[PDB]
Design a protein around this ligand. Structure first.
Ligand SMILES: C[C@H](CNC(=O)c1ccc2c(c1)CCC(=O)N2)C(=O)O
Length: 167
């Protein structure tokens, strides 16, 4: 039993809700919140900009030190950093950004990072400003993640379409 509330169960291990991931994280304080990161950990907009703003830019400060030490992530890769005031940890995961021409096949590799964590609060990878089809992202999530994932979908219209079209 966990404290995630109001989710629709899609499969044995995948759950979904129409919610703002920032407000969800502040309420639940999950062990892991997933960020929709880019390889530079530049948290300018989308989910990343919102999560970072909620940390009063502390996420960006920590991320800049991470990059200065380690260099950029790989598309499809991840790193674990602090969750600041939102969660114990933040798993920064880089899905492919279609608006940069990146290979959508890397979406499966991106979701594989979730399997290193027993329970996660997460957005749909490569959705929103990353330009991929969110219906496809949900399909890849369900077919790749085996650990317990709680998906927050900001857009109510999109949430209803994701549920209604889910096979
Ligand atoms: C399928 C799409 C992808 N978009 C996101 O995951 C997303 C985008 C921007 C923000 C948030 C989530 C949280 C609150 C916020 O301030 N910004 C959806 O979830 O609606």
């Amino acid at each position: 039993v966990n404290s995630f509330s109001g989710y629709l169960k899609l499969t044995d291990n995948v759950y979904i809700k129409n919610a703002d991931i920032v407000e969800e994280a502040k309420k639940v304080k999950p062990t892991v919140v997933v960020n929709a990161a880019n390889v530079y950990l530049k948290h300018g907009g989308g989910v990343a900009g919102a999560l970072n703003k909620a940390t009063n830019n502390a996420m960006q400060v920590e991320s800049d030190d991470y990059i200065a030490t380690n260099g950029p992530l790989k598309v499809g890769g991840s790193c674990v950093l602090s969750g600041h005031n939102l969660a114990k940890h933040c798993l920064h995961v880089v899905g492919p950004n279609v608006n940069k021409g990146e290979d959508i096949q890397l979406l499966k590799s991106a979701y594989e990072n979730f399997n290193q964590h027993e329970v996660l609060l997460a957005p749909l990878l490569s959705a929103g400003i990353f330009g991929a089809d969110p219906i496809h992202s949900l399909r890849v999530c369900v077919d790749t993640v085996r650990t317990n994932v709680y998906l927050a979908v900001f857009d109510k219209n999109l949430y209803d379409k994701l549920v209604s079209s889910f096979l």
